[PDB]
Amino acid sequence: VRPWSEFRLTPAEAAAAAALAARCAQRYDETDGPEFLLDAPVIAHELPRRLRTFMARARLDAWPHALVVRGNPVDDAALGSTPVHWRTARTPGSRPLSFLLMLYAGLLGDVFGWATQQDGRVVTDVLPIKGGEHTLVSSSSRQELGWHTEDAFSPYRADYVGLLSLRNPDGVATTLAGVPLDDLDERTLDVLFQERFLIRPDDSHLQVNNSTAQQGRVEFEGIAQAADRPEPVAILTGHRAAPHLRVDGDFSAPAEGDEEAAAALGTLRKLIDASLYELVLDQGDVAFIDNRRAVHGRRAFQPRYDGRDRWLKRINITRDLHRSRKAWAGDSRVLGQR
């Protein structure tokens, strides 16, 4: 069995999808422009029908932790070297694949970015940054990226996180875990459903991990409020037989002095640690991780820094953009508050 839903493109289907993305790259200036943001969901209707059927059906299944699409061709010579930083990572060689990721994402929902993450970009980059090996952000390497709900601190966090592997020569594993419902006793479950936990914003939302500019500066103040004064929230929500999950192994805490909540979180930690499994995104594989059913991370790896490091394109997806309307900057798709 597999805890995720998987689809493998035929070479013909993969070529057709690539051709469509290349056409988009020819017609539009960038992926994050207002034009392509609006058009991509409709252009995505031209993708191979079997893939559209998979994405429409698999999203509605009750069980999978992710939707995985294998077999998108990538030519390393055409792609070029892995960027040394996300700032300069919008290379011409990676451009068609960025368009491709957004097309696939459009079949699942409304894409968006954060003003406080990688300069408000919608399509972001995951790659190892020299000197940042032992950090809590996606550009880490030597230190394992601990399991987490994406942007757990925020009520506007994605429903799906898309990851497209541009290259991964050494097969470094993405980690995943669902709610450990087979082992959570009812008392512990009861406590996890109560608003007795604190969840602060991760380090990617700090100014230090963004470019030196006034572009999207006011949104960093809302990150500070979330870090300094986190209101108590629940870890589990919804149906007790299939709960949605909101937790971060490195940024979650119990409400101050609440030892019963602490015990529940401690138990949850051990159960997620013990059930954590691996998904290897080989070059050309795309995963859309269900950010409500599963937490995810990335195994520790030794970075190369020789031009062929592991490199993913990444995108946040929500089923309903209007859920985050308080955090809207304007007509843009870049979220944040004060």
Added chain:
Amino acid sequence: VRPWSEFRLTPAEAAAAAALAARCAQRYDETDGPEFLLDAPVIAHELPRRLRTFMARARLDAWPHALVVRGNPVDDAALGSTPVHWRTARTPGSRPLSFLLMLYAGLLGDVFGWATQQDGRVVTDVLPIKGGEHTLVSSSSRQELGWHTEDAFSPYRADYVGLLSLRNPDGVATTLAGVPLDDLDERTLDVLFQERFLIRPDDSHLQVNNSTAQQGRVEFEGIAQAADRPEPVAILTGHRAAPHLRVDGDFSAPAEGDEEAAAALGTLRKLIDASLYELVLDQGDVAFIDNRRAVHGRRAFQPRYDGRDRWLKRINITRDLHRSRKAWAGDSRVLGQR
């Protein structure tokens, strides 16, 4: 200006959409079968491109209370007489248009029904029922159907309510109103955002307005719990500059003894009453009402009972089916709890 977003099909576009719906009616046994429920969203990708662009873009706009599509051809001779009851309302003449409504709905989200409403049907019927002129349900006529959020009692209520006019010879108006934000003072607004109100299920969820059978019987018990023991909820949620609305003019009440909450609800009533406007769905018009931004109703009218009464097909749409997973019966798209 218009408070809703409007689209008029060209005759060619309308004919193409009709042709697609007719093809679906030929290929599938019914609209509510598991097959067409799953396929309709992908088949909808074959609708006229200008319409798909409208639906993709208009849904993301911040302002409209509804998305209105004009100009679907309807032949009264082909359609046949208006049914005397919803039970027998799945007539061959109305079948293609039911498929059409579901195709359009598939562009906006996941369709669903309620076990306690019209025998769990996904595509439901709005028509006057003889002897039921002065009721609080959609089959009323002589008594105005007061403004309401659809299924306000439930946290699984639709994001969009679709209404397709099969006929409306006397131009009876659907009523609509947004949040009266131009007139709500901040104190009143503050109170409406607090969990100080009760909202009970409407009369369409009662057993008396469903067929005599054991089909979907356990779900009526959850309706009783909502009616007997309503937990306090808010009327307004989300962004204060653009709140989402949850209210029913005939089923909302303040929390017991809460006079400040009562004052706020009383004020809201008068402001919605005063700002209520009309939308006439002529034969062939389809409206997708934003059930979070607007309340809606229907003007009082004199029923004919001569075979040509006003008749709509209706459908509930959610942006995320998994929001209601506690209320899932099984793999079906019919909601309810105990």
